[PDB]
Amino acid sequence: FCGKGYHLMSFPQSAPHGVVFLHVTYVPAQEKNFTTAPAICHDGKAHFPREGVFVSNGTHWFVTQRNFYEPQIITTDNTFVSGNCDVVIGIVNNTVYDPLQPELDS
Amino acid sequence: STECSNLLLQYGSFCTQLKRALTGIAVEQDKNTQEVFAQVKQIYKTPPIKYFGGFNFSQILPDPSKPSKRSPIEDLLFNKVTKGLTVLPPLLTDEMIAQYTSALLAGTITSGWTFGAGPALQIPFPMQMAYRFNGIGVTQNVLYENQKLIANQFNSAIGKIQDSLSSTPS
Amino acid sequence: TMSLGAENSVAYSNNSIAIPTNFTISVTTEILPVSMTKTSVDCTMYICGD
Amino acid sequence: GTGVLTESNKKFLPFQQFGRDIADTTDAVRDPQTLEILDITPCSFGGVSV
Ligand SMILES: *[C@@H]1O[C@H](CO)[C@@H](O[C@@H]2O[C@H](CO)[C@@H](O)[C@H](O)[C@H]2NC(C)=O)[C@H](O)[C@H]1NC(C)=O
Ligand SMILES: *[C@@H]1O[C@H](CO)[C@@H](O[C@@H]2O[C@H](CO)[C@@H](O)[C@H](O)[C@H]2NC(C)=O)[C@H](O)[C@H]1NC(C)=O
Ligand SMILES: *[C@@H]1O[C@H](CO)[C@@H](O[C@@H]2O[C@H](CO)[C@@H](O)[C@H](O)[C@H]2NC(C)=O)[C@H](O)[C@H]1NC(C)=O
Ligand SMILES: *[C@@H]1O[C@H](CO)[C@@H](O[C@@H]2O[C@H](CO)[C@@H](O)[C@H](O)[C@H]2NC(C)=O)[C@H](O)[C@H]1NC(C)=O
Ligand SMILES: *[C@@H]1O[C@H](CO)[C@@H](O[C@@H]2O[C@H](CO)[C@@H](O)[C@H](O)[C@H]2NC(C)=O)[C@H](O)[C@H]1NC(C)=O
Numbered sequence A: 001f002c003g004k005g006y007h008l009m010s011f012p013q014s015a016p017h018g019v020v021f022l023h024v025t026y027v028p029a030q031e032k033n034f035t036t037a038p039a040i041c042h043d044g045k046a047h048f049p050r051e052g053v054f055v056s057n058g059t060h061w062f063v064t065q066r067n068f069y070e071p072q073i074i075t076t077d078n079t080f081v082s083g084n085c086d087v088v089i090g091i092v093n094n095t096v097y098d099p100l101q102p103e104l105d106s
Numbered sequence B: 001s002t003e004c005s006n007l008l009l010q011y012g013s014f015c016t017q018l019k020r021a022l023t024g025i026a027v028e029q030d031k032n033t034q035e036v037f038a039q040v041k042q043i044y045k046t047p048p049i050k051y052f053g054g055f056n057f058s059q060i061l062p063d064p065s066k067p068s069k070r071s072p073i074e075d076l077l078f079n080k081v082t083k084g085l086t087v088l089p090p091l092l093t094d095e096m097i098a099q100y101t102s103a104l105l106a107g108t109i110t111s112g113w114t115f116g117a118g119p120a121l122q123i124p125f126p127m128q129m130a131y132r133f134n135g136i137g138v139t140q141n142v143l144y145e146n147q148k149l150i151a152n153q154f155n156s157a158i159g160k161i162q163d164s165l166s167s168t169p170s
Numbered sequence C: 001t002m003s004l005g006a007e008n009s010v011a012y013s014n015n016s017i018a019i020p021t022n023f024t025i026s027v028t029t030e031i032l033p034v035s036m037t038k039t040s041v042d043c044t045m046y047i048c049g050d
Numbered sequence D: 001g002t003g004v005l006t007e008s009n010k011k012f013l014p015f016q017q018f019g020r021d022i023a024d025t026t027d028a029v030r031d032p033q034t035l036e037i038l039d040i041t042p043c044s045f046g047g048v049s050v
């Protein structure tokens, strides 16, 4: 509706018998392949991304936002737990970091 | 009658006005078809293995057996719709419009909504459906846990759509 | 025969995703007519002159 | 006809007697007694709105 791509803003310009909209949109570029999984199996629990997606660069698993590659460590703050690992098709085994774990550990 | 044409020349540019208005309508119809169907500049194609996590798109994907390269639903739709006057053919033929729909289907199946906003980014169809579930405010786990049920419901609904179109005249 | 577009076979698989690593801020133009020329016709003067 | 007659800047050729404008209406005339060209601007027309 407001340009090709994800719309950010628009600017109106007057024209003879008309209006010209300069649509400022966000277009994704320089995409890269990653191995993806629906959920992460940790401690017999299934973890799902709260706002992102699980990606793998080959050896390590991360969670990133869907529209830009920004890999972050899979923690309990960006994932939520629902059910065990027996139901989700394609769940992979990976660790889920706990921010509270170094605090009681030290 | 040559004499009638000679007398018709006395009326001026009525004939030119009518031809120009009809020509405007004729180009407008082709512009309408371009606006509706030609919204992608890439002709996407489906992978040869039609497995999408249980989701069946055979009734909407093009049939290789048919010479028209139409889907079973599109074939049913085409079967169910039936002195100076001329009918100009549309600029986009039925097979090219079907090809445009096939490209849109391949983009929306293999890439979700990414192809409409830029380059087509591949995503597994269950993960795409989970994204769509998040769009309507339902968590991803609901889609993943009930993936076989959701795929069966979708296939049943698509079959019911084909049956409903084939069984209703209006 | 008119080319609908360039063929682009998307590499679909059940466990691979494509994530953008960059972006382009694209500004595009959309031209929409808003008004027409406001015309008034004197019916008597057009048909009959004086 | 009825119109305002003004002196014309048009260079009529010797055969030419009357002149037509963009829309093929008589906008210039040559006087039959003194061979001069006169523009015929129409009398002022206005749309009276209240
Ligand atoms: C996937 O990404 C991670 C993080 O970017 C990589 O892990 C790091 O790799 C560098 C390069 O050898 C090491 O110096 C770091 O110590 C690694 N960090 C950790 C926490 O292990 C990983 O190598 C990448 N994998 C691939 C296949 O590219
Ligand atoms: C992920 O880990 C779980 C448990 O750590 C694995 O489940 C075990 O798999 C072995 C071999 O298939 C079985 O003998 C065990 O009985 C399973 N245990 C449980 C509790 O299910 C699972 O196979 C791992 N998956 C992957 C892809 O590595
Ligand atoms: C997807 O759906 C189609 C039909 O909607 C399935 O094709 C049917 O397959 C069964 C078993 O081979 C046949 O008895 C039917 O006659 C087929 N119907 C039609 C219309 O061809 C197809 O098996 C489904 N699955 C896949 C993976 O394509
Ligand atoms: C992701 O990987 C796939 C293959 O696994 C890439 O698809 C290939 O791309 C090359 C170059 O365009 C083509 O010649 C091949 O025919 C493609 N193969 C298939 C099966 O489509 C794809 O380009 C990769 N994506 C990115 C962003 O690098
Ligand atoms: C993301 O893309 C932008 C271009 O849109 C890149 O910016 C260019 O970077 C090169 C060298 O890094 C410069 O020579 C160009 O002048 C830059 N262009 C602009 C418009 O600034 C940017 O480097 C890319 N970033 C990543 C991480 O890939």
Ligand SMILES: *[C@@H]1O[C@H](CO)[C@@H](O)[C@H](O)[C@H]1NC(C)=O
Pocket (backbone or CB within 6 Å): A089, A090, C014, C015
């Ligand atoms: C994905 O596909 C490959 C081969 O096509 C298959 O071996 C694998 O089990 C599939 N994974 C899932 C979760 O269906």
Ligand SMILES: *[C@@H]1O[C@H](CO)[C@@H](O)[C@H](O)[C@H]1NC(C)=O
Pocket (backbone or CB within 6 Å): D032, D033, D034
């Ligand atoms: C009489 O008319 C001729 C052309 O028809 C013109 O040259 C001449 O000047 C006129 N004489 C008078 C007195 O108007």
